[PDB]
Design an enzyme around this catalytic site. Structure first.
Site, PDB file in Angstrom:
ATOM      1  CG  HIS A 192       5.061  14.095 -28.783  1.00  0.00           C
ATOM      2  ND1 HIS A 192       6.595  14.174 -30.007  1.00  0.00           N
ATOM      3  CD2 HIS A 192       5.668  13.493 -28.010  1.00  0.00           C
ATOM      4  CE1 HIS A 192       7.196  13.492 -28.810  1.00  0.00           C
ATOM      5  NE2 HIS A 192       6.685  13.616 -27.961  1.00  0.00           N
ATOM      6  CG  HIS A 215       1.040  12.087 -26.525  1.00  0.00           C
ATOM      7  ND1 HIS A 215       1.735  10.780 -25.745  1.00  0.00           N
ATOM      8  CD2 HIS A 215       1.560  12.955 -25.563  1.00  0.00           C
ATOM      9  CE1 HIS A 215       2.091  10.840 -25.224  1.00  0.00           C
ATOM     10  NE2 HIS A 215       2.778  12.415 -24.665  1.00  0.00           N
ATOM     11  CG  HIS A 259       1.977  16.276 -21.203  1.00  0.00           C
ATOM     12  ND1 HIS A 259       1.146  15.965 -22.003  1.00  0.00           N
ATOM     13  CD2 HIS A 259       2.867  16.105 -22.313  1.00  0.00           C
ATOM     14  CE1 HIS A 259       0.979  14.342 -22.513  1.00  0.00           C
ATOM     15  NE2 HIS A 259       2.665  15.076 -22.697  1.00  0.00           N
ATOM     16  CG  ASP A 260       3.745  16.159 -24.953  1.00  0.00           C
ATOM     17  OD1 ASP A 260       4.979  16.649 -24.581  1.00  0.00           O
ATOM     18  OD2 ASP A 260       3.322  15.453 -24.977  1.00  0.00           O
ATOM     19  CG  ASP A 295       5.058  12.064 -21.253  1.00  0.00           C
ATOM     20  OD1 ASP A 295       5.824  12.875 -21.260  1.00  0.00           O
ATOM     21  OD2 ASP A 295       4.328  12.113 -22.570  1.00  0.00           O
ATOM     22  CG  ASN A 343       2.844   5.638 -25.951  1.00  0.00           C
ATOM     23  OD1 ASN A 343       3.590   5.523 -26.774  1.00  0.00           O
ATOM     24  ND2 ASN A 343       1.606   5.658 -25.312  1.00  0.00           N
ATOM     25  CD  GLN A 383       9.394   1.278 -29.133  1.00  0.00           C
ATOM     26  OE1 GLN A 383       8.808   0.717 -27.622  1.00  0.00           O
ATOM     27  NE2 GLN A 383      10.233   2.377 -29.649  1.00  0.00           N
ATOM     28  CG  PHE A 403      11.810   3.431 -25.145  1.00  0.00           C
ATOM     29  CD1 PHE A 403      12.222   4.831 -24.590  1.00  0.00           C
ATOM     30  CD2 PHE A 403      10.332   3.135 -25.133  1.00  0.00           C
ATOM     31  CE1 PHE A 403      11.574   5.810 -23.497  1.00  0.00           C
ATOM     32  CE2 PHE A 403       9.331   4.345 -24.593  1.00  0.00           C
ATOM     33  CZ  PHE A 403      10.162   5.415 -23.980  1.00  0.00           C
TER      34      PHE A 403
HETATM   35  C1  LIG Z   1       6.477   4.673 -28.200  1.00  0.00           C
HETATM   36  O1  LIG Z   1       7.774   4.511 -27.520  1.00  0.00           O
HETATM   37  C2  LIG Z   1       8.896   5.169 -27.269  1.00  0.00           C
HETATM   38  C3  LIG Z   1       7.873   6.688 -27.024  1.00  0.00           C
HETATM   39  C4  LIG Z   1       8.264   8.044 -26.770  1.00  0.00           C
HETATM   40  C5  LIG Z   1       9.696   7.644 -27.213  1.00  0.00           C
HETATM   41  C6  LIG Z   1      10.324   6.631 -27.952  1.00  0.00           C
HETATM   42  C7  LIG Z   1       9.730   5.813 -28.037  1.00  0.00           C
HETATM   43  O2  LIG Z   1      10.564   4.867 -28.565  1.00  0.00           O
HETATM   44  C8  LIG Z   1      12.259   4.499 -28.490  1.00  0.00           C
HETATM   45  C9  LIG Z   1      10.722   9.452 -26.546  1.00  0.00           C
HETATM   46  C10 LIG Z   1      12.162   8.895 -25.615  1.00  0.00           C
HETATM   47  C11 LIG Z   1      12.719   9.399 -25.985  1.00  0.00           C
HETATM   48  C12 LIG Z   1      13.964   9.290 -24.910  1.00  0.00           C
HETATM   49  C13 LIG Z   1      14.542   9.991 -24.029  1.00  0.00           C
HETATM   50  N1  LIG Z   1      15.626   9.608 -23.345  1.00  0.00           N
HETATM   51  C14 LIG Z   1      15.570   7.889 -23.772  1.00  0.00           C
HETATM   52  C15 LIG Z   1      16.808   6.956 -23.942  1.00  0.00           C
HETATM   53  C16 LIG Z   1      16.195   6.015 -24.475  1.00  0.00           C
HETATM   54  C17 LIG Z   1      14.813   5.855 -25.720  1.00  0.00           C
HETATM   55  C18 LIG Z   1      14.185   7.086 -25.315  1.00  0.00           C
HETATM   56  C19 LIG Z   1      14.450   8.208 -24.872  1.00  0.00           C
HETATM   57  N2  LIG Z   1       9.713  10.505 -26.295  1.00  0.00           N
HETATM   58  C20 LIG Z   1       9.638  11.782 -26.643  1.00  0.00           C
HETATM   59  O3  LIG Z   1       9.289  12.578 -26.907  1.00  0.00           O
HETATM   60  C21 LIG Z   1       8.807   9.903 -25.620  1.00  0.00           C
HETATM   61  C22 LIG Z   1       7.473   8.581 -26.368  1.00  0.00           C
HETATM   62 MG   LIG Z   2       6.216  16.122 -23.980  1.00  0.00          MG
HETATM   63 ZN   LIG Z   3       4.411  13.572 -23.965  1.00  0.00          ZN
END
Ligand SMILES: COc1cc2c(cc1OC)[C@H](CCc1c[nH]c3ccccc13)N(C=O)CC2
Ligand SMILES: [Mg+2]
Ligand SMILES: [Zn+2]
Ligand SMILES: COc1cc2c(cc1OC)[C@H](CCc1c[nH]c3ccccc13)N(C=O)CC2
Ligand SMILES: [Mg+2]
Ligand SMILES: [Zn+2]
Lengths: 318, 323
Positions: free
Chosen positions: A70, A74, A110-111, A225, A228, A276, A279
């Site tokens: 952050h 970013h 924003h961050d 946001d 990625n 990942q 995610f």
């Molecule tokens: C490149 O990879 C990432 C990028 C980002 C995140 C996680 C990443 O990789 C696991 C987390 C996600 C937060 C989050 C909230 N609820 C969730 C539910 C499931 C997973 C994550 C989250 N961030 C935090 O500011 C945004 C950027």
């Molecule tokens: Mg933020």
């Molecule tokens: Zn951000």
């Protein structure tokens, strides 16, 4: 050269890290400046370009260089990603120039001043930030307050030649956009996006009321946001490395204080690749599938890369 | 004299307590003495293991952070809202409904709900680009501030009155207090009242005839509107109390309008001491805000609040009769 890399400012997958290096760790400044020239923003809003650069430098300075994810790279990435999403053909002629400025400025701030820990960490540690903001969108409220306060530094008011009504309208939209980047609002934001696609009217999408238009701008910057895993893999993998470092550094602080370790934050029990994939499966792909549906099909190339990247990460899991 | 003050505090369970006389008799400490009296009356010191000196120390510090030079939003208003909420908590329709922790939260929220109020509106703070509005992004600017100050003062020396609550008790209390104070933002009134009307139309009561509130959303909604009613209870009080509150809100409004006029701004409604009608503004205030709210609360707890609603309607007729 820095100028050569910036020709791809209009393309998904700009070499953001190379630009960070070639600009002396000033990607936010050089990319914002390039965006303002590409969209004819300095002339449209009579922003002195010296005032723009002075604000941009000051803003970049308030991103922490020792925070792995952050930080100002970013910020630059979300700015340029937003910029590309604004020029989706299906959103052609949807947003006014003030709304475009709103989305871009919001993306840039924003961050800002992010400490590299989550809202929950700030709440559970009884931080000063959580006490100030009553546990609600603690970081996002702070990013906004810092981003606006820096306008008051010398030669930094890039909005000096906006009318009083323009400033008030801009300020509200920026606040609504940045508050929407709080991940605790994701599901509600997604539901609103889904509702918009089921009720979608098209000629190109027609959004008549501010409520729908700010909804798209919130989901846009939210998409930026969370963009990625939609970038080319070499960029995605560096973002993954950075967010895992930040998460692991937070887990060390939770561990050293004796707190329950936040999800994905325990370096001694984390699967980077499985997280990942989860995610993507649970957050990023549902979101970008809906966004692509909204602008069907100017986002197919984005959805394709995301699915390729998801495939690749899954393949790294024995 | 402490004897006379002790006598006046015998009315602490009564609507229309002489709160201004208590402020004078207590040496301008109405919030401290009324909170202390109510905590003693509800046995809260024993229930939550609150050391008496800690309670007094916190209360005095909190009261200190109300502005003595603001005519309405001061420590007397805070004491009034506390005491009014305390009476509303005892209504028969809510007997044994709320936990000790919820009662603590409602009363504590009332005590802090306006602390460090500068005597100008949220919109004035937004319009003048105040540091407060910049901090809170134009959203419930004052109310976020009252909460932040009220919680922050618990950290001063011998001020943590919740030192002996469990961690989950503090966590629960903190969220309820935030939920309640944020609901005192007048820009939330219409949505808050709309929800209260829905609750009334769908109300459930238990075998003993009290309100059935079996989930957080309903429980906090009742506490939010309770404290909001207490905050907007001036026109429901005996006329000699009500008229003093009117004098004070109008002085505060007029001082804001003077700052607006001096700044070349358009004066806020009711803030122009040269084009103001105190009496018409009170009648519109009751007719469009206070009576719709209190009529709905009275419906929620019917017939517990009928005398308060009658007083409100009498006072409305009285102000109307002066036009
Ligand atoms: C490149 O990879 C990432 C990028 C980002 C995140 C996680 C990443 O990789 C696991 C987390 C996600 C937060 C989050 C909230 N609820 C969730 C539910 C499931 C997973 C994550 C989250 N961030 C935090 O500011 C945004 C950027
Ligand atoms: Mg933020
Ligand atoms: Zn951000
Ligand atoms: C005793 O009298 C008053 C007491 C109070 C107010 C106004 C009074 O008298 C006109 C205002 C109400 C503001 C307000 C918001 N929407 C409105 C619509 C119509 C009228 C007023 C308002 N307050 C400000 O903190 C609360 C206390
Ligand atoms: Mg208030
Ligand atoms: Zn109040």
């Amino acid at each position: 050269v820095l100028a050569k890399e910036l020709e791809d400012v209009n393309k998904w997958g700009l070499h953001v890290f190379r630009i960070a290096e070639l600009s002396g760790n000033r990607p936010l400044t050089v990319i914002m400046h390039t965006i303002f020239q590409e969209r004819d923003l300095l002339k449209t809003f009579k922003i002195p370009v010296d005032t723009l650069i002075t604000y941009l430098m000051t803003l970049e300075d308030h991103y922490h260089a020792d925070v792995a994810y952050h930080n100002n790279i970013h910020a630059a990435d979300v700015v340029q990603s937003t910029h590309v999403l604004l020029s989706t053909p299906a959103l052609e002629a949807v947003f006014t120039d003030l709304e475009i400025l709103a989305a871009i400025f919001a993306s840039a701030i924003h961050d800002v001043d992010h400490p590299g820990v989550s809202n929950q960490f700030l709440i559970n540690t009884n931080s000063e930030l959580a006490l100030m903001y009553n546990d609600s969108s603690v970081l996002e409220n702070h990013h906004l307050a810092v981003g606006f306060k820096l306008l008051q530094e010398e030669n930094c008011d890039i909005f000096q030649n906006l009318t009083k009504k323009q400033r008030q309208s801009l300020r509200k939209m920026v606040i609504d956009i940045v508050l929407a980047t709080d991940m605790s609002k994701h599901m509600n934001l997604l539901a609103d996006l889904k509702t918009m696609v089921e009720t979608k009217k098209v000629t190109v999408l027609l959004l008549d009321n501010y409520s729908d238009r700010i909804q798209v701008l919130q989901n846009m910057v939210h998409c930026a946001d969370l963009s990625n895993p939609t970038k080319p893999l070499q960029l995605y993998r560096q973002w993954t490395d950075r967010i895992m470092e930040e998460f692991f550094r937070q887990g060390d602080r939770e561990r050293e204080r004796g707190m329950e370790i936040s999800p994905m934050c325990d370096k001694h029990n984390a699967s980077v690749e499985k997280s990942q994939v989860g995610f993507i499966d649970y957050i990023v792909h549902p979101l970008w599938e809906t966004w692509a549906d909204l602008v069907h099909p100017d986002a197919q190339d984005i959805l394709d890369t995301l699915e390729d990247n998801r495939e690749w990460y899954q393949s790294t899991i024995p």
